[PDB]
Amino acid sequence: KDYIVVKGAREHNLKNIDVKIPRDKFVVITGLSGSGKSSLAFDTIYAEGQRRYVESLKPDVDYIDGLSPAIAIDQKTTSRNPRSTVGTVTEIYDYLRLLFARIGTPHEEITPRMFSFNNPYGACPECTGLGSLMRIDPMSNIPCPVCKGARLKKESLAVTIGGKNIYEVCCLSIGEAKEFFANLNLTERQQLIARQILKEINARLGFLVDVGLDYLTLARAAGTLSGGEAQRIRLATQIGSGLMGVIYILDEPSIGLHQRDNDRLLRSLKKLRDLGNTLLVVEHDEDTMYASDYIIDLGPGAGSHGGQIVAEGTVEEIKQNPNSVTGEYLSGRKKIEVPKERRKPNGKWLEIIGARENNLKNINVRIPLGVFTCITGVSGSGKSSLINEILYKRLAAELNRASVKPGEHDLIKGIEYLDKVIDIDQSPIGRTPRSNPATYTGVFDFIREIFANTTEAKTRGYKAGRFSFNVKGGRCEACAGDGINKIEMHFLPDIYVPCEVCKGKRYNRETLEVRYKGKNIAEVLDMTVEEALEFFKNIPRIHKKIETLYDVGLGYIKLGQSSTTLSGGEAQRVKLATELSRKSTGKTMYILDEPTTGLHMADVHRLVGILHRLVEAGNSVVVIEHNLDVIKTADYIIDLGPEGGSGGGLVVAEGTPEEVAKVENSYTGQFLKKVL
Amino acid sequence: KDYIVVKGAREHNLKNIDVKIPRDKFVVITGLSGSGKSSLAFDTIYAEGQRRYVESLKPDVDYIDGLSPAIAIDQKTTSRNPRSTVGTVTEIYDYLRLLFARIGTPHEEITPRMFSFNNPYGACPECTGLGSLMRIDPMSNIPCPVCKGARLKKESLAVTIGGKNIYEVCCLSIGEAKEFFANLNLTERQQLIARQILKEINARLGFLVDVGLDYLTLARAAGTLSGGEAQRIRLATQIGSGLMGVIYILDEPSIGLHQRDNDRLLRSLKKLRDLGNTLLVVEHDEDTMYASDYIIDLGPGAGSHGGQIVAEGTVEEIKQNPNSVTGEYLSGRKKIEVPKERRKPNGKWLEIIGARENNLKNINVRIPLGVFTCITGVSGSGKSSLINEILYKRLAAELNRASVKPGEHDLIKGIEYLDKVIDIDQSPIGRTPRSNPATYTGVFDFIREIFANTTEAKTRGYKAGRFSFNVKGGRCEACAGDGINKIEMHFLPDIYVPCEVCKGKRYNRETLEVRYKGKNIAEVLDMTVEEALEFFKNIPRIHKKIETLYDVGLGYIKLGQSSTTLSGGEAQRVKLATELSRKSTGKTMYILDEPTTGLHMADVHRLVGILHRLVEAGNSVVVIEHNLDVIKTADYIIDLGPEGGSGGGLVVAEGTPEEVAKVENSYTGQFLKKVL
DNA sequence: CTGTTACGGCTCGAGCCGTAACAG
DNA sequence: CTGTTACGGCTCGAGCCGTAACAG
């Protein structure tokens, strides 16, 4: 029917909830980090919709009614193939080659297959159409000397329209290519025989421009792209294809996108929906809520304290609902307050000389030390390059002795003012089931000593290393401390089940005999942080670490959770807590690349508090954030622009946000003037 | 929108046609064999719909608007896996195990995973849940001695409901299982806690019964199934899943199904469509046309003479259209006439003694010789087993000395009355690009001699083998007579393009110099049969073979077409022409397994004429046909029934169709009484 | 001339945890 | 007591075409 009825969903931490999502409408799922929105969407609806279609050619839900095939558009990147480019992915190269073979004037007969690099007819004989000959320097990729990177035969390059061949057309940026195709002149016969192709090309280019990627080049390889750029390219391609009756699931479509493009992105999403589809956008932006037809709010907390549908309905009912977390922040009951007094530089600056990496226009920038510094700018302005490829790499090479090649820069002044450089990202903190937050924070070494300092341990002569599931002697011998066994089937992939010897306790019978304060090591490792905070009140050495973990918002997690199952936000919060627990020497540099990726308003407030605490501790924090709430609390803002692509790479404004708001020709300043 | 607009389609032999298929409606595509309906549907619409969805996770059309994801349900069978059974495919085993774990009374706590054979918890330790231990006899599959084929642990078999465990329930036929579940009694608590599961099981069993497979057992392996049974199982599963907004493409759903189940199949198709889908059924049945909302007719002929949309609209407009081929047969302008005089047996009979293979109830049947004999019966009555597994195999072993194990039968009387056995099926006649209809019919040897009989060939001393693309000396040396070359790409599968040396002519420069009647060998091999009929009028030796090929309806095909690209109908017609060209000795046996699979009414009439010619030639033809038009023209009908499955396997009626129509308790007789 | 049989030949090392030692 | 550094250890052969020879 016209509803996606889900009854009896218990995936992950869902508390047996029932929902009725309307069909063919814009639906936004909102909740705190780890509340369960991501599980409820991806693991249930996307999984069921994909399985029910692939099986034609296993969620813990009871039954779902009215499920169309589901396509997931998330921030995922793959190496792909060298044959794939931006134009190939967007399916505009086919129309380009059709137009070239139809109305192309040469400078056998011209054929559409003659312009393709995926067929032997038009592919360059030397590089086989790849465009680059990868040779291992006595594998460094070098341009093909024959085709000069065009990846086509020399004969096919004679066909030109408007004075430009196919490679020159494909090398232009999307916006200027659309402008060139718009004002092109053709006779009556050419217009009659190439109306459909021109209309399709114009429509696809307009969709790509409206999405936000008006600076990309069609000749750029699809492999070398960011997550946001790839996701936006996929959204534009899906709009162009025009599939009907398909449920689309989006994970934070506004990630890595400036505030000025939000209206265009919302219009693009509405246009995609209007052709007979449904959207399940999982977004936390304030502007996105007001453009939706149905909001589903989970909570009220996270982990074991959430998973229930707190509120449902339109934005007005969400605001009027008192127990909804999202409505409290939307209505203005709780909000982030702009600081009254801002820190000032002490006279120590980091100046980068001759930064010309990628599209940077050989500029010099000064970064204050000891203050919270934010970097803004339009999409594709070169801020990410300028930070990651130059400053972080040079600092790592100078301090940590890391052998990573920096970008195209001359030198940097002020290296002696820092002692170490630390990068915090959503990368997982572990790849094996042998690490948990308890060991990463370092509190496990204290808990082991506390356990070994008991009367029974001294009586039995147990050492500090006995109570650890990583050495021989204390762990379970049957499962080798992993807690699971390997069972192989005849025609099925190997399955993993809990070990029968220890029942998943990870320790042998002898170890479990000891008990401190009525609990053994398994009970300690199988309790949440909010309980270990009260349990370890007497001991301050572990109390400090537990309180630090609780401060970053990890009061719902348990010390025994494997690092493999941790999400990006959990890993980032664990790293932040670990850095908080350390001893600040006043010479530490923290670099964060958009830390607000997938955080609610309350999580943003907590992260702002933690960042201010870290700055006040005596160190310096530099972040690249597009969120105005984080931006307005900064102490020094560097703006890059004034546009994206070849037009950008310069510096528009610098200084405190109050000074930046006074700059007329700056989008960030214009937005800051209104928000303040 | 609400239309699938296709503009500029030129796949295979389509003559650049434009169509506008309505959406969310029952659409039937009708045309002659080889007209282009199959191409237009599968190669264009299914391919585009599948690609546009797979690429998210290349037809010769210009653009298609409004394409939902497409699922194709056709008669294809795969080995699959031993883990897959009928219940697993139909997704009823999950509900069965849920019910057993919920309300099961035993004779850790009971768990749904305990009843599954795909998890180590409930899988039998010996056979690993497969159910059969395949060992190579000094690989014969024998039942597992531990679980006795149940493929489960002995502990889980104690759980019983209604006096039967899970294996006994899964071993019942679908109809009797539905009856058992319908009259089962349970208390108020059991009904309250298992209402949804029971409702789902009853609905799925009812769907399976309505489809037509009320005799299958849930424990039967999905691998050992026929094409029609697998297609019907897939249709029932797709109905059960309940996908919305998906285009469904069906290829003759009424293949291998009795006339009495047509109403149930049509109701099932309408029920599948009514939940918000679209159907593209490609059917030729007369009853199916009257149940359609839109009929698209191709033609007017086949091959190069077809590919254009002759007529469109409802059944009334199709009938009123004069140039439409389908309307002429629907309105009654052209029809098959029942013969007035029928041939009678001459006193030679083939008696099968002790036929007990599969569900045959140890019966004896007499087959007349020298007359056209048809075999009828309900679906799954054992006719196909009785013919293929017993009679054909025994005849092949006795005459062709083929070492194939026959079925469970005692002996056969009348083997000496036959000299050879010939089986005609839709199997391809060749697997390599070295065989074409010209060589298979045998006319190529005559054409080679005709070419070598010319003055120039004698002058140059060319032999008969010079003009053949299969030996060294006459063929092109560069491409070795294949006509295509192999080109390898760096990161792409090898592609094939026409050879540059010979331009696909398959012969060297010297051979092409010779010419007979103004045409060389390439021109002879690149002309249709309808042209070679007039070209070779003078020579009777090749004229007979060409006329024989033309008679079976292959006047649109060319002698140079590779056997790899031939479809099933083309291969069957080629085999029929080859058998016609031979010399009849009066002791030949022809066995056909539903030869009307994918044939129009005109094709059915032509096939009936060819079969009558073959019978009048002095041989005997035995076919297993479900088409009443073919049945009413037979001379001896053997009916098997009176039901399908364990209830069938007997003989209901025998003799001429007039006598069979007098039998009251026979479905075939009841239908023959009305049709005559 | 026509059918049959047999033969010949062709293709299909990296990252993290735990521990010992040293220095503040 | 706390931080750092170094080290040890663990896991991720069949089927078809062409031809020579023989018999009707």
Ligand SMILES: Nc1ncnc2c1ncn2[C@@H]1O[C@H](COP(=O)(O)OP(=O)(O)NP(=O)(O)O)[C@@H](O)[C@H]1O
């Ligand atoms: N490998 C590359 N080859 C060529 N051009 C590149 C490459 N990497 C980046 N660029 C370009 O150089 C600039 C880099 O900008 P960058 O700082 O990565 O973007 P950004 O501002 O962080 N945008 P966003 O991802 O939306 O947050 C852009 O104009 C890119 O198109």
Ligand SMILES: Nc1ncnc2c1ncn2[C@@H]1O[C@H](COP(=O)(O)OP(=O)(O)NP(=O)(O)O)[C@@H](O)[C@H]1O
């Ligand atoms: N391998 C097998 N194992 C067990 N039972 C089988 C097997 N093959 C067939 N059967 C059963 O034995 C009977 C065979 O009937 P069969 O003659 O194959 O069907 P049919 O009349 O041709 N039906 P259809 O496919 O609709 O045309 C049916 O009852 C089958 O369920």
Ligand SMILES: [Zn+2]
């Ligand atoms: Zn090249």
Ligand SMILES: [Zn+2]
């Ligand atoms: Zn164990």
Ligand SMILES: [Zn+2]
């Ligand atoms: Zn067994």
Ligand SMILES: [Zn+2]
């Ligand atoms: Zn060649």
